[PDB]
Design a protein around this motif. Structure first.
Motif, PDB file in Angstrom:
ATOM      1  N   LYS A   1     -39.949  31.299 -32.420  1.00 33.72           N
ATOM      2  CA  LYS A   1     -41.231  30.904 -33.001  1.00 33.72           C
ATOM      3  C   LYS A   1     -41.211  29.902 -33.934  1.00 33.72           C
ATOM      4  O   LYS A   1     -41.983  28.576 -33.990  1.00 33.72           O
ATOM      5  CB  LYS A   1     -42.232  31.755 -33.213  1.00 33.72           C
ATOM      6  CG  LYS A   1     -42.465  32.973 -32.033  1.00 33.72           C
ATOM      7  CD  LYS A   1     -43.553  32.512 -31.214  1.00 33.72           C
ATOM      8  CE  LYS A   1     -44.124  33.514 -30.191  1.00 33.72           C
ATOM      9  NZ  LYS A   1     -45.169  32.880 -29.378  1.00 33.72           N
TER      10      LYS A   1
ATOM     11  N   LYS B   1     -41.596  17.695 -20.990  1.00 37.20           N
ATOM     12  CA  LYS B   1     -41.621  19.101 -20.755  1.00 37.20           C
ATOM     13  C   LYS B   1     -43.009  19.380 -21.186  1.00 37.20           C
ATOM     14  O   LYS B   1     -43.894  18.639 -21.424  1.00 37.20           O
ATOM     15  CB  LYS B   1     -40.633  19.547 -21.778  1.00 37.20           C
ATOM     16  CG  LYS B   1     -39.906  20.864 -21.489  1.00 37.20           C
ATOM     17  CD  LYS B   1     -38.878  21.193 -22.522  1.00 37.20           C
ATOM     18  CE  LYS B   1     -37.911  20.061 -22.690  1.00 37.20           C
ATOM     19  NZ  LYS B   1     -36.813  20.293 -24.113  1.00 37.20           N
ATOM     20  N   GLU B   2     -43.467  20.738 -20.993  1.00 36.59           N
ATOM     21  CA  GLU B   2     -44.681  21.225 -21.543  1.00 36.59           C
ATOM     22  C   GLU B   2     -44.840  21.718 -22.957  1.00 36.59           C
ATOM     23  O   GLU B   2     -43.769  22.115 -23.435  1.00 36.59           O
ATOM     24  CB  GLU B   2     -45.235  22.229 -20.344  1.00 36.59           C
ATOM     25  CG  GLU B   2     -45.340  22.224 -18.841  1.00 36.59           C
ATOM     26  CD  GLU B   2     -44.017  22.401 -18.405  1.00 36.59           C
ATOM     27  OE1 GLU B   2     -43.009  23.169 -19.175  1.00 36.59           O
ATOM     28  OE2 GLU B   2     -43.550  21.870 -17.315  1.00 36.59           O
ATOM     29  N   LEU B   3     -46.064  21.317 -23.552  1.00 37.75           N
ATOM     30  CA  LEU B   3     -46.233  21.629 -25.032  1.00 37.75           C
ATOM     31  C   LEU B   3     -46.600  23.155 -24.847  1.00 37.75           C
ATOM     32  O   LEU B   3     -47.410  23.697 -24.694  1.00 37.75           O
ATOM     33  CB  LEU B   3     -47.278  20.784 -25.575  1.00 37.75           C
ATOM     34  CG  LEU B   3     -47.253  20.957 -27.100  1.00 37.75           C
ATOM     35  CD1 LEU B   3     -46.082  20.430 -27.882  1.00 37.75           C
ATOM     36  CD2 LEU B   3     -48.273  20.010 -27.482  1.00 37.75           C
ATOM     37  N   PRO B   4     -45.707  24.099 -25.550  1.00 36.70           N
ATOM     38  CA  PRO B   4     -46.159  25.450 -25.800  1.00 36.70           C
ATOM     39  C   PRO B   4     -47.488  25.623 -26.443  1.00 36.70           C
ATOM     40  O   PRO B   4     -47.567  24.913 -27.753  1.00 36.70           O
ATOM     41  CB  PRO B   4     -44.778  26.130 -26.424  1.00 36.70           C
ATOM     42  CG  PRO B   4     -43.696  25.152 -26.103  1.00 36.70           C
ATOM     43  CD  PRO B   4     -44.182  23.784 -25.868  1.00 36.70           C
ATOM     44  N   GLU B   5     -48.356  26.256 -25.950  1.00 34.28           N
ATOM     45  CA  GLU B   5     -49.528  26.750 -26.636  1.00 34.28           C
ATOM     46  C   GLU B   5     -49.334  27.796 -27.875  1.00 34.28           C
ATOM     47  O   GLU B   5     -49.449  28.832 -27.345  1.00 34.28           O
ATOM     48  CB  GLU B   5     -50.572  26.836 -25.477  1.00 34.28           C
ATOM     49  CG  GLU B   5     -52.214  26.557 -26.018  1.00 34.28           C
ATOM     50  CD  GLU B   5     -52.931  26.279 -24.860  1.00 34.28           C
ATOM     51  OE1 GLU B   5     -52.568  25.662 -23.969  1.00 34.28           O
ATOM     52  OE2 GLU B   5     -54.104  27.272 -24.854  1.00 34.28           O
ATOM     53  N   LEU B   6     -49.107  27.294 -28.921  1.00 34.90           N
ATOM     54  CA  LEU B   6     -48.906  28.516 -30.013  1.00 34.90           C
ATOM     55  C   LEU B   6     -50.079  29.164 -30.497  1.00 34.90           C
ATOM     56  O   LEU B   6     -51.271  28.541 -30.731  1.00 34.90           O
ATOM     57  CB  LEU B   6     -48.285  28.005 -31.172  1.00 34.90           C
ATOM     58  CG  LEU B   6     -46.747  27.296 -30.861  1.00 34.90           C
ATOM     59  CD1 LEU B   6     -46.292  26.615 -32.233  1.00 34.90           C
ATOM     60  CD2 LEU B   6     -45.858  28.377 -30.627  1.00 34.90           C
TER      61      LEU B   6
ATOM     62  N   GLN C   1     -43.576  21.416 -32.927  1.00 32.89           N
ATOM     63  CA  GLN C   1     -44.941  20.762 -33.164  1.00 32.89           C
ATOM     64  C   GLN C   1     -45.241  20.094 -34.400  1.00 32.89           C
ATOM     65  O   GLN C   1     -46.065  19.037 -34.114  1.00 32.89           O
ATOM     66  CB  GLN C   1     -45.891  22.095 -33.051  1.00 32.89           C
ATOM     67  CG  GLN C   1     -47.455  21.758 -32.759  1.00 32.89           C
ATOM     68  CD  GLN C   1     -48.341  22.998 -32.566  1.00 32.89           C
ATOM     69  OE1 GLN C   1     -47.859  23.726 -31.642  1.00 32.89           O
ATOM     70  NE2 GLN C   1     -49.395  23.003 -33.119  1.00 32.89           N
TER      71      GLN C   1
ATOM     72  N   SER D   1     -53.591  26.280 -34.236  1.00 33.98           N
ATOM     73  CA  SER D   1     -52.147  26.142 -34.786  1.00 33.98           C
ATOM     74  C   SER D   1     -51.641  24.982 -35.592  1.00 33.98           C
ATOM     75  O   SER D   1     -50.904  25.208 -36.430  1.00 33.98           O
ATOM     76  CB  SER D   1     -51.061  26.486 -33.486  1.00 33.98           C
ATOM     77  OG  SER D   1     -51.381  25.082 -32.437  1.00 33.98           O
TER      78      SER D   1
ATOM     79  N   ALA E   1     -56.963  23.613 -27.367  1.00 31.32           N
ATOM     80  CA  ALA E   1     -55.448  23.982 -27.494  1.00 31.32           C
ATOM     81  C   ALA E   1     -54.778  23.129 -28.614  1.00 31.32           C
ATOM     82  O   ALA E   1     -54.824  22.033 -28.764  1.00 31.32           O
ATOM     83  CB  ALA E   1     -54.638  23.950 -26.410  1.00 31.32           C
ATOM     84  N   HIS E   2     -54.213  23.904 -29.437  1.00 23.27           N
ATOM     85  CA  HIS E   2     -53.383  23.370 -30.543  1.00 23.27           C
ATOM     86  C   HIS E   2     -53.919  23.094 -31.940  1.00 23.27           C
ATOM     87  O   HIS E   2     -53.493  22.566 -33.129  1.00 23.27           O
ATOM     88  CB  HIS E   2     -52.350  22.097 -30.238  1.00 23.27           C
ATOM     89  CG  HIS E   2     -51.629  22.100 -28.794  1.00 23.27           C
ATOM     90  ND1 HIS E   2     -50.852  23.088 -28.719  1.00 23.27           N
ATOM     91  CD2 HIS E   2     -52.030  21.595 -27.597  1.00 23.27           C
ATOM     92  CE1 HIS E   2     -50.102  23.002 -27.293  1.00 23.27           C
ATOM     93  NE2 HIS E   2     -51.148  21.912 -27.030  1.00 23.27           N
TER      94      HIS E   2
ATOM     95  N   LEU F   1     -43.855   8.538 -25.784  1.00 21.48           N
ATOM     96  CA  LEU F   1     -43.590   9.808 -26.063  1.00 21.48           C
ATOM     97  C   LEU F   1     -44.585  11.017 -25.457  1.00 21.48           C
ATOM     98  O   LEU F   1     -45.631  10.991 -25.785  1.00 21.48           O
ATOM     99  CB  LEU F   1     -43.451  10.126 -27.647  1.00 21.48           C
ATOM    100  CG  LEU F   1     -42.668  11.171 -28.132  1.00 21.48           C
ATOM    101  CD1 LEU F   1     -41.145  10.848 -27.874  1.00 21.48           C
ATOM    102  CD2 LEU F   1     -42.751  11.677 -29.599  1.00 21.48           C
ATOM    103  N   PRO F   2     -43.882  11.922 -24.494  1.00 19.41           N
ATOM    104  CA  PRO F   2     -44.472  12.779 -24.230  1.00 19.41           C
ATOM    105  C   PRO F   2     -45.463  13.652 -25.192  1.00 19.41           C
ATOM    106  O   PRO F   2     -44.906  14.006 -26.238  1.00 19.41           O
ATOM    107  CB  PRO F   2     -43.945  13.750 -23.439  1.00 19.41           C
ATOM    108  CG  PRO F   2     -42.397  13.501 -23.646  1.00 19.41           C
ATOM    109  CD  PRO F   2     -42.406  11.731 -24.517  1.00 19.41           C
ATOM    110  N   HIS F   3     -46.780  13.845 -24.858  1.00 16.43           N
ATOM    111  CA  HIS F   3     -47.720  14.528 -25.618  1.00 16.43           C
ATOM    112  C   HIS F   3     -48.239  13.722 -27.028  1.00 16.43           C
ATOM    113  O   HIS F   3     -48.943  14.174 -27.858  1.00 16.43           O
ATOM    114  CB  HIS F   3     -47.225  15.881 -26.279  1.00 16.43           C
ATOM    115  CG  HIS F   3     -46.630  16.884 -25.267  1.00 16.43           C
ATOM    116  ND1 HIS F   3     -47.194  17.234 -23.946  1.00 16.43           N
ATOM    117  CD2 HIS F   3     -45.255  17.234 -25.138  1.00 16.43           C
ATOM    118  CE1 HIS F   3     -46.339  17.859 -23.275  1.00 16.43           C
ATOM    119  NE2 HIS F   3     -45.120  18.019 -24.077  1.00 16.43           N
TER     120      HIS F   3
ATOM    121  N   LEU G   1     -37.894  16.127 -27.992  1.00 18.70           N
ATOM    122  CA  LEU G   1     -39.205  16.014 -27.727  1.00 18.70           C
ATOM    123  C   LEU G   1     -39.623  14.840 -26.999  1.00 18.70           C
ATOM    124  O   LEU G   1     -40.568  14.445 -26.685  1.00 18.70           O
ATOM    125  CB  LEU G   1     -39.938  15.894 -29.415  1.00 18.70           C
ATOM    126  CG  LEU G   1     -39.932  17.261 -30.107  1.00 18.70           C
ATOM    127  CD1 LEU G   1     -40.429  17.055 -31.589  1.00 18.70           C
ATOM    128  CD2 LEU G   1     -40.633  18.536 -29.336  1.00 18.70           C
TER     129      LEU G   1
ATOM    130  N   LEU H   1     -40.353  26.296 -32.318  1.00 20.37           N
ATOM    131  CA  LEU H   1     -41.705  25.776 -31.676  1.00 20.37           C
ATOM    132  C   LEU H   1     -42.392  25.139 -32.612  1.00 20.37           C
ATOM    133  O   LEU H   1     -43.188  24.083 -32.315  1.00 20.37           O
ATOM    134  CB  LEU H   1     -42.163  26.846 -30.750  1.00 20.37           C
ATOM    135  CG  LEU H   1     -41.376  27.452 -29.414  1.00 20.37           C
ATOM    136  CD1 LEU H   1     -42.483  28.317 -28.947  1.00 20.37           C
ATOM    137  CD2 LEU H   1     -41.046  26.111 -28.657  1.00 20.37           C
TER     138      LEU H   1
END
Ligand SMILES: [Zn+2]
Ligand SMILES: [Zn+2]
Ligand SMILES: [Zn+2]
Lengths: 58, 97
Positions: free
Chosen positions: B9, A22-27, B16, B70, B66-67, B41-43, A18, B12
């Motif tokens: 899945k 990278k790109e964050l997958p849109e779940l 998250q 989820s 988005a997110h 940290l990215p994101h 993490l 991931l």
């Protein structure tokens, strides 16, 4: 000792890649409902329940 | 029951989840500290804002940001999951030194 420790969390962050750019997958909601199910739709946390849940680590 | 569970899945989801846990503590650190830290940290910024939006979001599952949907489903699983053999939580709940 119910709250998660920061030092361990950072190890998890790095061990899961993490920290890599990278790109964050849109779940989708549907995928989470299948792979991370809750007893019922009445148990969807809202408001302060969300923050409280991230403090504990049952 | 429904469709079959995807191990990709699941990975991931716990990625998250770990990012959400970080962002929350990354904010609680500033909520007690006081000063505004520049996390690299990215994101992290993204999930911080997701958390802040979600605490007053009323659209539930239907939401568009988005997110948000989820994350609500994931954090809800995190709280309610007691199983010791859960493939999503076990690496996280049973992390340790
Ligand atoms: Zn951060
Ligand atoms: Zn929302
Ligand atoms: Zn679980």
């Amino acid at each position: 000792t119910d709250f998660i420790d920061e030092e361990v969390l950072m190890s998890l962050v790095i061990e899961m890649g993490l920290d890599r750019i990278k790109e964050l997958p849109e779940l989708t909601s549907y995928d989470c409902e299948v792979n991370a199910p809750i007893q019922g739709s009445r148990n969807l946390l809202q408001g302060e329940e969300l923050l409280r849940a991230l403090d504990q680590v049952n | 029951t429904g469709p079959t569970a995807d191990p990709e899945k699941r990975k991931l989801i716990q990625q998250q989840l770990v990012l959400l846990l970080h962002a929350h503590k990354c904010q609680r650190r500033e909520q007690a500290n006081g000063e505004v830290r520049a996390c690299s940290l990215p994101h992290c910024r993204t999930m911080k804002n997701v958390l802040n939006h979600m605490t007053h979001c009323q659209a539930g599952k239907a939401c568009q940001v988005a997110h948000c949907a989820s994350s609500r489903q994931i954090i809800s699983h995190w709280k309610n999951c007691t199983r010791h053999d859960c493939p999503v939580c076990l690496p996280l709940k049973n992390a340790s030194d």
